[PDB]
Subunit: 123 residues, 4 copies
């Protein structure tokens, strides 16, 4: 939901995701990672299902961060894919792909995979 | 690589990715999938490294499609995470995650993973 | 970690992983899934690092289940890749890939990804 | 597909996968990687669907390598999950997860994902 997703989210690492959901299905915001080659806030953009099912299924969504801002450039990008689950203990359950720019000889080693769970309460 | 990425791309399935790269690192555009629960064009947004390394490595990028447009809603979203490699054989090499909305009981089964390679012809 | 890995483990879904670690780095056992329409026990085999680092690093391992037994055949296989953490909170943190047999036209839709955490306590 | 799968396979990196498929669903063999922290052959074990569908679907399978042999220990393991596709041009299409032993604080960064296609030729 628009005002379900909009706001501040924390994952299990202590990273902070501040997002605004548009009526169209846009997500826009900033991300601050607690870990990795990262400092301060990075722009994010994504999309969500702006007319989800009302059968107790989650709301599908995804977003991207390119790890370039006015401090640092890690030459990498992370995408989170997952769903917003509402009601009590609201959460966004995600899996993510982090791709680093590599030479083609090393492209086999370009991409990390993991899982982040975001909650409304600070961990 | 604003000029390198901006344009039409095709993956191995015949899906069509039309993207504009902004100087600020933004990606915006439309995606049309050759497969799945998909009809016509869907909005995409993403981000790329607008100041890449100068050493021959690729340009990292990612984008999202939520599979809702004016025709159809599949209650799902896909993210592609990858890199742009330039030249005459320019390609975008990606891996993707497609999450469908599920109940919490079925959340273990929410997410498909695959790989798409996009090129400028075909 | 031969003694550490050997045992009965449960994940967050209530699945049961019974495994014996061999000195050679072998894992052998049975898996019972609580979800995904599996029935009874399936054979598993895998490998672990039989000489891990001593710095507090986890022990890397992986195993495979093909979802065929005497009762049922899902025409699929799951692999788990992860690490065993020792000491007080002994856990195996994994990500997994579940591939189903598909036609070539449908191969894009062959593979689910997820994450399982296994502990010796049943949830 | 016992004899379909049994034998020598090569991926796009020049790695070599030598495998024996048992009647009982077992896979056993050796793996030699062309890349990464790897020298000589490593033991693999896995499983495959020993009674696949007859509808033109591939045969599901998976295997594991822990990257420790007589020569080296990388403190990591890779699992490949995929399917064997027979007929005219035989291939094993896989995705893989490579997990390195890490501390708990660094476990976010433990796992690489990729895709390997193995063919009969080369
Ligand atoms: Fe690395
Ligand atoms: Fe499905």
């Amino acid at each position: 939901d628009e005002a379900g997703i909009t706001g501040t989210w924390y994952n299990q690492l202590g990273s902070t995701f501040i997002v605004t959901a548009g009526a169209d299905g846009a997500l826009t915001g900033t991300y601050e990672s607690a870990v990795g080659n990262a400092e301060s806030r990075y722009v994010l953009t994504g999309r969500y299902d702006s007319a989800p099912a009302t059968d107790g299924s989650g709301t599908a969504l995804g977003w991207t961060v390119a790890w370039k801002n006015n401090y640092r450039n890690a030459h990498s990008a992370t995408t989170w894919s997952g769903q917003y689950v509402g009601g009590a203990e609201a959460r966004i359950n995600t899996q993510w792909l982090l791709t680093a720019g590599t030479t083609e000889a090393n492209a086999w080693a370009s991409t990390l995979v993991g899982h982040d769970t975001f909650t409304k309460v600070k961990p």
